[PDB]
């Protein structure tokens, strides 16, 4: 209505969205946040506002962890804190056996994968029921840790005593400001992860190594000259 929105806005997008959501910028030309989609009742499909905003915040947080971790052992590897043996790239540490695989681990990569499957299956499955039944993981006995899974009105922001042990949303303005900060940084991290994956295929090196090569030669080490 008043704020200078992003390039590529739409009349109908401004008709169904304007300054209400945290990442509200009027950028939805494809029309996926339209309330006319899935006009019935019940479970339904996936393209709907309730699930799409939930998917955007979950993607933002996972991409922030990924972008911070895909360059951390390489940045510390170029520094003198981490040992050079464990300072490998993010695509040769077991994610893809063909690119490469780290050797000295405390277990086999498949064993670590099974442990990860059980652990993250518990986490993501408990995360799904709360979305299906709001605030239902605080009723069944789960090792006495039911006091930390109380949930909230929004599935994207559960809060509680664990996820929000350090209280920061004392005021709605500061809570909304911090929410906008999380949304913007998560979108930047998603683009950084996309850049990390695309740069890893053309250059075949780590993400921080591409920046060091681009800084030493701006024209000799750029995208246009990389596909040569």
């Amino acid at each position: 209505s008043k704020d200078f929105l992003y390039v590529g806005s739409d009349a109908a997008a401004l008709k169904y969205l304007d300054g209400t959501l945290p990442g509200d910028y009027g950028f939805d030309p494809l029309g996926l946040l339209d309330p006319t989609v899935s006009n019935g009742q019940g479970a339904g499909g996936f393209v709907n506002p309730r699930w799409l905003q939930y998917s955007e915040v979950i993607h933002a947080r996972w991409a922030m962890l990924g972008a911070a971790g895909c360059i951390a052992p390489e940045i510390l590897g170029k520094a003198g804190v981490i040992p050079a043996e464990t300072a490998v790239d993010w695509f040769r540490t077991g994610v893809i056996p063909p690119a490469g695989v780290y050797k000295d681990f405390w277990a086999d990569p498949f064993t670590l994968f099974f442990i990860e499957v059980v652990a993250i299956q518990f986490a993501e499955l408990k995360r799904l029921q709360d979305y299906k039944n709001p605030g239902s993981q605080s009723r069944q006995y789960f090792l006495g840790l039911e006091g930390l899974f109380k949930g909230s009105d929004n599935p994207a922001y559960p809060g509680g005593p664990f996820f929000n042990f350090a209280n920061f949303g004392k005021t709605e303005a500061e809570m909304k400001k911090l929410k906008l900060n999380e949304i913007k940084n998560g979108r930047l991290a998603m683009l950084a992860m996309f850049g990390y994956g695309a740069q890893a295929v053309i250059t075949g090196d780590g993400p921080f190594d591409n920046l060091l090569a681009h800084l030493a030669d701006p024209t000799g080490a750029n995208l246009i000259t990389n596909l040569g």
Binding site: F110, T111, F114, Q129, R139, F142
Partner: protein, 208 residues
Amino acid sequence: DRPLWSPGSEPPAWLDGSLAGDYGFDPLHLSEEPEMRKWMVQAELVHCRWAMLGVAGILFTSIGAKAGGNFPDWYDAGKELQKNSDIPLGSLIFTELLLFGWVETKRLYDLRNPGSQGDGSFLGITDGLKGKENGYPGGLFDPMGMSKNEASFKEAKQKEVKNGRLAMLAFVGFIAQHHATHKSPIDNLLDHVADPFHVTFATNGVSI
């Protein structure tokens, strides 16, 4: 009001929690009808009892074989125990089938006609040979009077179901680790504690 198999889900209508070992896990809607439920509960109880006896026997002979006795492993046990035996096969098969026909036929007719075999027909036994519950007989199969107390009988029934399910889940695991390693279950257990990081289900060639 009771812990369910999926925290946050809702149990079915025909599973209130009054059954022995009820948790609300029934996605394929089996045992929805009263007669089908009456048959399925007895099928689970008989499977739990046979699984507990079989797993206990396998672990006993396997532990005895690891200790030093002349016991064969759980797999291929019938092959090397029949070559040096005077009891002929076929005759042993039909002897087992003949005795089991009598026992299982009396147990089946006890299910279709509840409290019917205890009528002085089989050698004059009236007090016993009549079940107390669905798949819980009494009179003769209860030497110790532990069923004459509902407060402890309910808890003991819960213990029986929860132990039988773990035993049959363990029996399925006996076949898998045997077919994956060609060793005894007690040999696989002792080998896992000797190296919990290197040896596991992912470092045995098979199942990858």
